[model samples]
Every structure is written in structure tokens, then in C-alpha cells.
Target: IKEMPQPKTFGELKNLPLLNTDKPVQALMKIADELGEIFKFEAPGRVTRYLSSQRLIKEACDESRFDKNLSQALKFVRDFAGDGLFTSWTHEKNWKKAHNILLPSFSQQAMKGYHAMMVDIAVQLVQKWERLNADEHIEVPEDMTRLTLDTIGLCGFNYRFNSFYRDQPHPFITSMVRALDEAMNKLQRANPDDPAYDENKRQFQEDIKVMNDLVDKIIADRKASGQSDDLLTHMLNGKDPETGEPLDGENIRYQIITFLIAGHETTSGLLSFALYFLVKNPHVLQKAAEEAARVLVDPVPSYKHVKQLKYVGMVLNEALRLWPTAPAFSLYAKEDTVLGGEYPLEKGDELMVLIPQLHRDKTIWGDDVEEFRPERFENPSAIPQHAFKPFGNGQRACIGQQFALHEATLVLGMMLKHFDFEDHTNYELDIKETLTLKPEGFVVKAKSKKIPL
Candidate 1:
């Protein structure tokens, strides 16, 4: 481990055999396993990358000290996420302003208003599966995407994509997926002038236009209908407390687009991965199913009922540790500073926090780091602070932490009460990297729990 190859330029990084192209997420684990944690590679110019270090990761994400900053690596992601303005810059003054106004929109009360929508979508997915028949291969990601798209559609700006009822996803979703693929693919290949992504550029722009138009139309319709109930209404009505100013059309649309894409994509990956783990580990699946059976007697789980499914939440937490949805977040030092009191983070030092590394750290999580065990999270507090920030950390961790957890748990509960999952391929996860982590080509079979009458 003393002497190792470090690619000092994008051209060089792209030339390596193992990572010449995107590898499976498991392949990433193998690389990290083979190569010790915390190695540096170079990008064109003076760009330096620090990978998979538990030490000082938290300091880099200190919301007050080191606000979220993006490297050129993630800039393309911002384009698909909310290039208009809002979430594209998580630390800027205007972003903070917009974030404050939107904060209340994701509160428990707000999410409660949307539980019925969550339950309805979960039911739609189950029935769709029922028709697919028992022991059939399911494109779990596709249906999971439909579930999330429908939820975000109805609850985000109060539009209904109704993705499950249809055979094809909306052009907006399809476009965004293509755009994300093109962007990340280019980032990995590291040829800014790649002709393939240049071809992708037009379709990517068209996708953004569709999403922007959707938000614009929603704002216009709300104005015409005089409805002040949903998230769009709040963004339209609320003021930036920092400035006491109303949001502009372009910026408000940015906030909307960010939530629309960010709100749905990660959770879909997350839910799919969580289910993969549950079914693959029968003991864990039984525990989760038993908890759902005990707690979620209602065909529909109220927000109150969801809170009672604590073990299920832990199960999801363990899944997140093993396969984090937002795999990495960017941070850099504003000025010369020390991180974790051991590593000196000089000014201009850029960091890409490998969240999965911190999550699965052998020191932090002990020898069972690689196993699917929810018991580890039963007292996550006792484990220590900042060590388990799967959603993120500090003041700006994730505005939708509760939103993602509650919706996922509720849907999982609804599904679990009806069926016990069965493994089709007896598969292990295959990770696909987009802006968010995706379980590549993952599917599961199910056996109904309801007794024959």
C-alpha cells in the first residue's frame, strides 16, 4: 500500500482499466477494499480529490463553518437538479433565503397532509404487482420510480403525473433520467468535450424546459384558481425571512424543480435498495414484516402509526449505511482550518465525502460493518454523533429527512402487511451511479400474507 498509482489528470484518470468507465457500486467497494481508505487523485488543473476518509468528514460538512460547495465534478448534476438557481447553490445567500421559506413546507404537518397520497401510491404499486403474478421478475426500480413520481407530482406542485396507471413515464421523468445518465457518464469518462454527451446536450436541455414549464404552469394555475393549500402555494405566498422579500418567478421555479427532482429520485433508489436487503436477508425481512404486522393494522398508516414502526426505520437505517442514496456531498475549506483536530484543511482544499465509507467504517460500526443488521441501529445515539449521518448533518442536513423516512416507512409498512418478499435471483445488489445511487436492474418476488378465504 506504500506506493500506488495516482492519476494526476482527467486524461490519466480516464485511462485506468478498472475505472475506465462506470463500475458497479460493489466494484467501488472492492476498489476501496483493495486500496486503503483516503487516497488522492488529480483532475485537470489543480483539482485534488480525497476519497473515503472517516476522519474530518464531518468538519468538511460543518454547516456553519463549511457550507456545501460543489466541485466541477458535480456541476452537471446541478443542471438537471435545479440549474435555474435554488438548490444548485445550497450555501448561497439567495439559496438560504429560498430554503428558509420552503422549510415549513416539509414539516411533519405538511407531510401529514400528503400521507393519503403516499398510501394511495403504495396501494397502486401493490395491485400492479399482484397482476404481475407471484414469483415473477419485477423491475422494482421502474415501479418505485412511478411511486415516487406520483407522490412528488401530487404533493410537490399539486400536479398528478399518475405514472403507475400509465405504461410509459412522463417525458419529463424520462428526459431527466437520460440527462443524469449523460452527465455522470461524462464526469466519469472525464472528457468535457465528449461527443456522446454533446449529443445528450439537446435532449438534456429539452428535459429541463419541460420541468421548468411544468412549474411555471402550476404557478399560473394556482394564481388563476386561487388555491393556497399545497407546496406551490406556500412558496408563492411565503417571504424570505432574511430579506422579507417575495420570491421571483425564476427563483421560485428553481426551488420547485429542485424539490421535484431531489424529492423523488433518491428515495426511489433508497426504497428499492431497502427492499432488496430485506428480501435478501430473510431474518431481517421477517423482523421488518413482523413490525409492520404489529404496528400497521390500518390498511393505511397514519403519520402516528408510522412512528410506531421503529424497528422498520432501523432496518431502513442499516440499509442506508450499506448503500447510501446520496453517495457523496462536496465540501471545501473557506480559509485555512483544522478538521477533526488531526488533519489540517488548508484553504482551497476540496473534499468529496464518501458517505458509504464513513457509514461502514470498521472502527465506528465494528466488525459487522458489511452485514445486514438492523440491531446495530437500535441505539444509534449510543454509537456517537456525526458518525451516522446517512441523510447528512448539521443545520442543512436534509430538509426532507422526515419526509423521506416517513413516506418510505409508511409505504414499506403497507406493502409488508400484505406480502412477504421472496428472492427471485437470490441476488446481491448491483449499484448504478447517477446523480443519486441506483440499484441497477434490481427486482424482487413476493408471496401474499393474506389467508385464502
Candidate 2:
């Protein structure tokens, strides 16, 4: 194995350092001088590839492929984000095919369904938190993850996973979490040939198989029992115009799993990170609270009110910028290519663009790059296209970005309207770099506000 080279300066960075270490201004200046063209350049193929992967996952889940492969569903799901699914589906044919189905799913009517689900989940979570906190101190991350999972289950699949209830954990939930942890550890080791890798892989496979079988049973039950009002049913009933073929069981399963994982994991991180920022930056919290008060009149905020909370939106944006759910997105060069005119790459080379770097780039974001400034995004023209890509750029951007944003706004607004957030300044927050950036040991105390309804 070759020794990893260190990047100590801008010149070293040109060689493509593993870890970016240059000052924000210096690095941005170098990127502008050497790679400005690349920044302007839109990697449409990469974006299309990502969208196609998401489509495949949605299609497969909708079709129930993961339902049959429950033990390894997470593996399949994770692969959707990596070369396994995304790379395989980047072809023009697949891109067009996937988009045909995906566009309808994001229609105004369908988005209304998503919004309704978000409101239901948000209300449920607030109720749970209130009940739990009435007597005992609750672990936020675990409890929040459970709440998020249940929401995903009900909204995404119309299944009652009961992940949030006070009882023994569901086998599927337990296995999925364990599989994720083991997978992360295996990847950290980076030994593809390790026997432990095989063992973990086998365990993951077993878990997916169980989940797939369960989902199959559910599908069978739904078929025999008549139609469901859930999104899963709509997906199953969805058909292709040209082929006159409805998405198969495998596709439905994949889509459901995709939504389950995406809805739960990403939303949990967003809420947790938002809370972290709200507590850390008192001014941001105060502004968000004021906006929430002005916008929300009832105990439960409506979808219309969710849209009106601009300061809450800005706070969420700032949090997302500082601790993006996904730190970096990778693209494999399809052919010999030149990025930013100067950096040349071979066909197989992988480019990992770090969102954190772009978010904090001093030259682009100015002196307040490290500070929590929600106002930066108030004007759309203030930031460059490539500079603020939280959901990504071009066609490959997240399809559910709007859905996620609305959900975050509602949750934050409801939280701010009801409770006053107190910063636990003594507790140090450690960042855990994963598929999504998450906090380690993040805890905050909240008190009920005296605002009249």
C-alpha cells in the first residue's frame, strides 16, 4: 500500500489532498483561480445518475424486492447511494424511465399527501415528547429516531412498526440498526476481503431477507384485504404509459424502503442539528421563536403557517450548511475529463466534493462563513449555484428536498412555539461523520413557554 500524502498548502491541494486543511479564503481563492470553471460546470450526468439511483430504489421498494430480502434491505438501500445502484442506473434509458414515474409522485396532489403525513408525524412527536418529559428525562436521539421511524412506517408504508412505543424493540428495527453499525465498522476497516466483512455481510443479508419476507406478507395481505389509502398502494397502482405495466412488487418494496430510510434518518438528523444550532446560537433561536410566534396561532401549526416561518427556515438552512446531512457526494468520471480546466482526471477516478468545504468557503460565503447567519439565503442571488448545494445541484438533486424542508419547518415551528430551548453549554458535542453528519451526546433542556394560544 502506498503512503497517503499530506496536503499542507494550496499547491498540495492541487494534487488533491485527502483532507482539506487550507484556510477558507485561501482555499476558495485557489478553487476560483484554478477550478472556477469546474464550479460553473454542471455535472449533469452525475446528477442524473443520482436521480436514477433514487428511482431504482423507489421502484424496487415499490415492487417489494427488499420485502423479500429483509435481512439485506439496508445493504441494498445503502448501495442505492453508492456505485451499486446509482452507477448502474445512470444510463439515458434508465434515467428517462425512472423520471417518468418520479415526476407524478412529486405532483402538487402527491405533495399534499406528503404534507399531510408530515403534519400528522409532527403532532405525534410533540405529543410523545410532552408525555415522556412530563415525568422523566428522555434520551433525545433514541426517542427521536424511534418517532421518526414510526412516522416513516405510517406515512411511507402504512405499517405500524410501533418503534416509538414503550416495549421491546421490533426485530426489524433492531436488526437494521445493528446492520448499519456493523456496516459502518466494516467500511471503517476498509478490508473488503476480511472474513468479518463476509460475516457482517451474511448477517445483513439475513436481516434483509426477514424484512423482505415480512413486507411480502403485508403485500399479500393488502392484495387479499383490498386497497390501502397509503402511498404504497398508490405506487403499486401506478403504471407506465408506454409499457402499460404497473410497477411490480419489487419496485414498490424498494420505494417504500427508500422512503422509510430517507424519511427517518435524514429527518432525525435535521431536527437534532436544528436543535443543536438553536441552543448554541441564542440570537438565531430568538429570531426563529419570534417568527414562529408570529406565524403560528394554534398549538398545532398548519401547513400554511409552516410556509410563513422564514426565520425558522433560515435557521434550518444555517444548520444544514454547518452540519449537512451528507458531508460529501461522490462522482466517478465516465471518461477522461478535465475539471476546472487545470485538474485532469482519468476515466475511473472518483471525485468526492465536500459540501462542508463549499458551505464554509470564505471567498464565496465571505467573513461570516463560520458564523450562523440565516440571512445569507434571504436573497437567492447572494450565493452561487454550486456554492450552496445542500440538496445537491441539477437534476440529481434530492426529489424530496421540498418535502424535507416543509417537514423541518413544521417541526421547528411547533417546537419553538411551545417550548423555550435552553443551551446545555457544559455538554460538549462531538460530530459523528456517517452517511449523514450527526451529533454525539447532544442534549438540551427545554421549558414550556408562556405564550397564549
Candidate 3:
């Protein structure tokens, strides 16, 4: 075991490219370019080591030595999400109960039932874009965000944000955006006594209430209308088979909020990046569209039809390889151990799995790692285990894996079948960060293909 390398920093101050910077990941990526496989970074109130290579990251993924650890930034999300699945500590009982209760709801069979609802929302985006003039530019990720949020609302709880019907997004979108941005800003600022902190705290609380009231109303309405087949009904009615325990009303509220938060953000980012990659690489777009056309002979995709979109599935996987929406997840040692059989870590030392660097590891992905090549995923067996973890790791991984994949594939299939996309701006990729990564200010124009009346 050896001592970890660290960036030079002034006394008691955070390192360069502080976590709250506008382009922290890009800056951190640059640091990884210069530093060793494992490097320590100092920030106010926290010191974290980041693992940049698959070898070290693979060792850290071991459950015996490490477990999912929430950064203070993620914990700040608990202000609204509470002990819901995304923010709940790994050892918390509530997470176990909720995890077991909701596991079946996200199963492959359950996604089959959600197919119609997903098509409903996907068609909303299609319909909205079809009506737009060919010359008009569409903000890529913003529209994608609307589609995903509306999808989760309808499919998860039988609620409708109707995000496309209105010129503005649902109030939930605005409020949630502000609340999540504040959560990150809370970490950047060190002083609690500043008036800025007080003002932000008050505004944050108010925004939290706006969301709470909306979700609470949805829960109340579901209760009044009796049960349905959606996720909310399952959570409201589900119990632990072993212990017969039910989620408390408050935790149910948090779970509903958690679903809305976790369910949409990463999926929308995936779709946005996929679209950007397609527009930038028209040949690949042509191939994906051809696959979509062959599989989805009809305008709308059935569950069976979406399952046949193999090439589009590859496109999405390659997009995730380039830009994992949930960029990095925190981890800590379960016991004192050596990582990568070289670096010593004490129990509870915080570390981040630098997924962007890990994904681009030249050893595993080759020198052409930066290129968007969908065919690399054609034979999943060729790839090493733990080398590509876009959905994250282990027991605390994203529960909506099937849900997100099905939704993205269905959306990508239909969109490819209908629209020929054009990149209006010669835009270089610029990512925006709140709690996640997205193609910032990226715009495209979509020309409609002739549709049968």
C-alpha cells in the first residue's frame, strides 16, 4: 500500500475547479489527465480521493471493502427527497423496505404494462415537433426534459404534468430545478451566517413546499379514486412479504418525490446525448433510423417492437459511454484496505468513481475511446465487467434501469422513424450541471418525414 497523490493547494482552501464550478467535471477530467490513477482532492469540509482507472475502480466496487456513500451535495437533496430510495443511506432500513417493495414494480413484466403510457408521452413530443416549422430550432435537452418528466408523471402515478400542452413547463419543473440547483450551491458556499444563505434557505424551503403540496395532492387524489396499476398504487398498497411492513405516509411522499427526481433526470440526459450524437454523426443516424423503420413498421412502438430496436439500443449504450448522466457516485471504505493492491485507505475514507475517465480508459476501450461507435456494444461479452457502469454499481444502483432503457429505446425508435434532424448551430458540446450533466444550449431542427393519415 502507498500514499495517494494530491493536487497542490493553498492552506485550508479548496482545490482548483471546486465541486460547485460551472464545469467541475471537465476541470476534474483535466486533473485526471495529469494525476495518477488515484488522487486526493481537498475541499472545504471534505477531502475525497477519486479513482480514474478501471483497475482501481474495480477494486473499490467490492462490497466487502466499500459501499455507496452519498456526498454532502447528494445529502442536501434529502431536504426534499427525505429517506427515499435515491438519498437514503445504504444501511438505512427504509431503503431496504422500499427497495424490496418497488423491485417488482420495475421488473421486465411491469415495464410491459407501462408501454402504452410511455408511448402516450413519447407521442406528445413527436406531435409537438411535427407541428413546428422545419426552419425553427428546438432546444434539445429542454424538450427532452419535458418528455421524460411527463412520462414518469403519467407512468409512475397516473398523474399528468401535461408538460407539452402548456407553453411553460409544469410548476413542479420550475420548483424542482430551483431546489436542486440550491442543493449544489449549498455545498459551494461555506458560511451559514451570510444573508445569501438565509435568503436561499428560505426560498429553498418554499420551493420544497410547492413540490410537497403538489405530490401530496396527487397522493390524496389516488386515495380518493381507489387503486390503479401504476407505481404509486403499488407503493401505497405494497408491503414487505417477510415482515408485512408498509411504507409510512411521509416516506411514501418522499418516495413519490424521489421517483419524480431520479426517474426523469438521468433518462432525459441519455436521450439528449443520444440525439446530439446522432445529429453529429449522420451515418450512424441513418443506420439507427433504418433499424427503427424495419422494426417499428407502425407509427407507434409496441412493447414487442421496441424490444426489436437492437441498433438503437446500441446507440443509447454508446451515448451513455460518452456521457453518463449520473456522472459520478460516491463510495467509502467498509473497512481499512488497500485499493488496486497499492494505495491504503482507512475505513470510511470518501472516494468518487470518476466515471468519465473510467469510461475512456484506453486499455479497455482502445485509443478510439473518444469516438461514438455503437457497434462496440454489439457483443457485450467482449467488454470487461465493471469497466462500463453508466447505471452505477451494486445494490444501490438505479432501480429504473429497465424503465429508462425501454422509455429511451421507444422514444428513440419513434423519433428516428419520424424526423430527420439537422444541427442548426455548429455547436461544440457544452454541459450544464445542477445535479446532473446535459448538453447545454444545444439546438437542432427536425424535418418531418411523410406520415400516413
Candidate 4:
């Protein structure tokens, strides 16, 4: 007879026997072997389970059915699991709204707008940094997060919160962060067999309600006051091909919440990681500056220049490799299937596609897996298929991946153009894994570049 299954809780799951720190991919392979062809994991009373079977991967990635409902549900689940900010709508509705509204507004053109807004925010940030401490060492993640949040508010909603420019913390910003912290604490406290499971669940529901109400008010205000040309307006006024009708308020709200929650945290993570990596790898930082100076002859870099900065792209790619905001892709098996001829999965089982594991896989990425090497992506052809998936893979990949890339590139390029990071404190960056991987204290210090008067 087979031995009893292990990994009873999230903490235990993190410390499973197969989770080899040295070689995470190897660990996954080992786990796959022991967990049978298809491990239909049921963690006691927990709603989620891991379907370690590789077969589920194939079924989830298959696009023949074009199951829009599944797409939306997956997005919702991912958002909820990743952020836990909104909970009013079903997954089908979320997906439909994304396809109908979010996709169009998050296009290349929209990304240019995002770039412009981010550049503005970055300039504002530089001014703030200079004002606070001229040439003094300062931790910058909080400022960066605030700047990115302000950019999202302006670009995503056509309403500028100007939180970054404010001297005091904005109430909305404080409330949002507090709600996120509370939800995360509860999620951590949750267990499969806990008698207080219902209470924990209720707390999460209440937090989501608060967030949903805020989103609703934002959407309603935008609609009633006359929609601006930002994403909210674009989504609200966008015509659906199937129905040929304008998207309603609910559609607008879903897309807005998706963009707002997904946008701020992921971009913040990218910026934080980029700053950390740049400080750690001084040579790489120099190369990025050289590339920025060469490409951006003007004071501020533009959208056209962003594409030409290959080194910046590699730097961003490396940062993503080291610290993906959403490092794992979670999917529920819709049907039984096979993947890589290795593992079989059954319907209703969940698969958490660990992107960080895949990125650091020695088998695919070779011996330098742990090293910070931006050169790996220098030759795009050299990278393995499905080995490096920061955004995700196949049809249901992030709609805003390109947008995020462009935004990071522009912001990073411009920042490098103006400032050379100086690690005065030499503080070792401590990372915390949450819905998004982020720096624990929201701090990274750098000195502004001296421009000749």
C-alpha cells in the first residue's frame, strides 16, 4: 500500500521533502515521481489543492475550446489568490470584461500612455528625492510604489490622486494597504481543519467588500462626471463585438479593479527588484547607464527610445527572473490530460506552475541559475521554451505583460539617465513573498546623478 500524503498546510507545503533549495526544479521532479501520476491533493477542509500531474498543464493551456468563462474564472482566481482585493463578480464575468475592455485599453498605444505617465511620475519622484536629501542616502521603494500608484491612478482611471506629491499619506492608499495586510494575515492564519475557518473566510469577505465598494465609487464618479479619455472611459465606452453594445458599469468596475490591483503591485515589485539587482551588480548598472545615455540623447526618454534599449530589457528580464511578482501560475484542471508524458492529472485538481522554479532550473538554465546574469537573455534564441515565463504562458497569459514591460523600461531607463544608484547604507535587501514578491521595508537607496549646469 502507498504511504500517506504529506504537506498538510501552506507552511508544510513550503517545506516539503521534495522542495530542494539547491535545485528547485529537481525538487519538483522528485515530488512528481512520489505523488503518483496524478496527485489529487485534498488538504483536509481547504478549498484549494495541488494537482502535481503534468497532464493538467496541457489541458489548461489548450485554446481549442476558447472557453472565455474559464479564462475569466482563472483571471479572477489568480487575482483573488494573488491580491484578494475584489470578490463581487464571478470568474466568467471578470474574463469577459477583461477581453471586452481591459485588452483594448492595455494595448501598445495605451502602453505608450502608461509610459508617459510613469515618466512624469519618475520626474516628480526625482524632485522629491532631491528636496528631501540632496546626495544623502535614502530608501526609495516607498517613493517608487507611491509614484507607480499615482501613475496607475492617472493613466488607468483618468483621475490623478497625486499621492506621490502629497506630504502626508493618502487615506485611500493607507486603507488599501491596511486591507491588503489584514487579508494576507488572515490567509496565513487559515488552515484546512481549523474550527475558525468560517470566521477567517468571513473576514476575507468583509475586506473584499470594502475594496469593492471603493472601486464602485471610483467607477461611478468617473461615469457620472463624464468619462475622461483614460482606461476607464475607454472601457465604459468600448463596444463589444458580440453584442455590439457599450460595456456597462459592472464591466468597467471589473476592469478597473483588475488594472488597479494588478497594476500597482506588479510594477512596484518590478521596480524594487530592478533597483535591488542594479545595486548588487554594479557592472550591470554601468552598462544600463551607458545604454540609456546612448539611446536617450534627450533629457527624458520617449516610447521610441524604450524599444532600442536592449541592455535595459535584459536587466528587466534578469530582475524578473530573480523576482517575478506573480512567480507561480495556478490553474484548475478542466479535464484529465497528459503533460510532457510525465504526469497525468484529473479534473478539478489544481496546478501551481512555479515560474521561479522553472527560471532557476539547472537543467534548462544551466549552472549560472543563481547568479545575476542579464546576458542570458542577450540572445533570445538561446533561451529555452517555457523555461522563462514571468508573465505566464499560452492564451491566458497576462494582458498587461507588454504594458508592464514598456512601463518598466521607460521608468528604469529614465531613472538611470538621471541617477546612478549609490549604496551608501549597503543594507542587504531582504525579500518578502506575498501575493507579489517584494522588498520587506519598501526601501532601496541611491544617489542622483550630477548633471553639469
In candidate 1, the residue pairs with backbone N, CA or C atoms under 3 Å apart (3 or more residues apart, or in different chains) clash, namely: none
Q: Model 1: which ten-residue window has the lowest total lDDT?
A: 1-10
In model 3, the Cα lDDT at residue 253 comes to 93
In the order shown, the candidates' Cα RMSDs to the true structure are 3.1, 8.7, 1.5, 5.4
Better of 2 and 3 by TM-score: 3
Best-to-worst order by TM-score is 3, 1, 4, 2
- Kindly indicate the candidate among 1 and 2 with the higher lDDT: 1
Error of 1 at 215 (Å): 3.1
- Candidate with better lDDT, 1 vs 4: 1
What global local distance difference test value does model 3 have?
0.86
Tell me, by lDDT, which candidate is best: 3
User: Candidate 4, which segments miss by more than 4 Å at Cα?
Assistant: 1-42, 46-94, 134-136, 167-169, 181-217, 224-227
TM-scores for every candidate against the unseen true structure: 0.90, 0.77, 0.97, 0.80
The positional error of residue 224 in candidate 2, measured at the CA in angstroms, is: 4.9
Quote the positional error of residue 243 for candidate 4 in Å.
2.6
Q: In model 2, how large is the Cα lDDT of residue 403?
A: 70
- Give the alpha carbon lDDT tens digit for every residue of 1-453 in model 1: 133334333345542334555643444555666655554545444444445656556566666567666665457666655543324566566667777777887887788888887777877887776677544767877888998878877777777777877887776778777767766666555555678757757877887778777777767767777455667876788888788987777677777777777788889988898898888788888888889888876656777999899988988888888888887766667788766564556677776667787787887788878889989987766986667767765665788888888888887877788877767787777777775787878877777776221
